[PDB]
Design a protein around this ligand. Structure first.
Ligand SMILES: *[C@@H]1O[C@@H](C)[C@@H](O)[C@@H](O)[C@@H]1O
Length: 46
């Protein structure tokens, strides 16, 4: 009962949305980045 910021799935790139205290959190893979998982980390050779 601390606000629901996971109704329209704010996460992206198949990110997992989880309702947390105050705000929320997007659980994604280690190869992804960004607040809403919208930055595919494709480097490999970098
Ligand atoms: C939610 O967590 C993320 C990290 C991925 O494993 C998703 O497939 C899962 O549903």
């Amino acid at each position: 009962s601390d606000g629901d910021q996971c109704a329209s799935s704010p996460c992206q790139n198949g990110g997992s949305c989880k309702d947390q205290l105050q705000s929320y959190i997007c659980f994604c893979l280690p190869a992804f980045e960004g607040r809403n998982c919208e930055t595919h980390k494709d480097d490999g050779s970098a």
